[PDB]
Design a protein around this ligand. Structure first.
Ligand SMILES: [Ca+2]
Ligand SMILES: [Ca+2]
Lengths: 148, 115
């Protein structure tokens, strides 16, 4: 599953073409960092090298278009990689009914990983049918997010 | 260099002895500093990279560039070229979230396993 239809190739094409400068045909670390820097969020030089290690198995250090397309596309939208996501929650759940409380959920989301501000934490709640007590069923939340 | 000093006085200050004790083996909430502790940062990254992958809307500016195109339409003059190279931020977010997510899976696996 690399596309459903050829329309999606246009979305992938300009996503690549935002990164590539001057038609050299492959994305180097300088180009990859440059788009993010112009937008206004700049990863570390170490992070950029870590990123272009895991992507690009040819191992030359410049990202090719079908390799990028393969990375973007993979299997389309799916209930993907569940054991990796699901067990990640299980390291840090509140109690043996399978939930995380909202106050702790905001504190981990704000201060770890990608570091959310409070409104986008509330947006996570807003996509799930939660009323009253504010306790999040992570296993169900993963089903809703990765629905197909 | 720096030391802590305390004062002790009186007799029979706490005669009752119903101090709590453990009569069995049960799970206790904790972080194992050597290894288990270092999984906090990747797990949060993996979860929040995945959320971006789902997201159709975010608190960030999507529609602002379309409002600038409406200001272009109000002027009476017409230009064949139109806007040039409009930066695609929503497309850019889609491109970086998948890379961040794939890296996050490897980082979760190289924090599940540690030295
Ligand atoms: Ca290039
Ligand atoms: Ca390459």
């Amino acid at each position: 599953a690399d596309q459903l239809t050829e329309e999606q190739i246009a979305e992938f094409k300009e996503a690549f073409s935002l990164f590539d400068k001057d038609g050299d045909g492959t994305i180097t670390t300088k180009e990859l960092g440059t788009v993010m820097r112009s937008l206004g969020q700049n990863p570390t030089e170490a992070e950029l090298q870590d990123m272009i290690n895991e992507v690009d198995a040819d191992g030359n250090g410049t990202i090719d278009f079908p390799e990028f397309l393969t990375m973007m596309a993979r299997k389309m939208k799916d209930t993907d990689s569940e054991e990796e996501i699901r067990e990640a929650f299980r390291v840090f759940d509140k109690d043996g009914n399978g939930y995380i409380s909202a106050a702790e959920l905001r504190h981990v989301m704000t201060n770890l990983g990608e570091k959310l501000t409070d409104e986008e934490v509330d947006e996570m709640i807003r996509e799930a049918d939660i009323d009253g007590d504010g306790q999040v069923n992570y296993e169900e939340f993963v089903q809703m997010m990765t629905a197909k | 260099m720096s030391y802590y000093h305390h004062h002790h006085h009186h007799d029979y200050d706490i005669p009752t002895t119903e101090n709590l004790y453990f009569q069995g083996a049960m799970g206790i909430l904790g972080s194992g500093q050597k290894h288990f502790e270092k999984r906090r940062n990747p797990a949060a990254g993996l979860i929040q990279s995945a959320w971006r992958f789902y997201a159709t809307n975010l608190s960030r500016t999507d529609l602002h560039s379309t409002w600038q195109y409406y200001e272009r339409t109000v002027t009476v003059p017409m230009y064949r070229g139109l806007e040039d190279l409009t930066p695609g931020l929503k497309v850019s977010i889609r491109a970086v979230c998948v890379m961040r997510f794939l890296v996050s899976k490897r980082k979760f696996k190289e924090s599940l396993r540690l030295d």
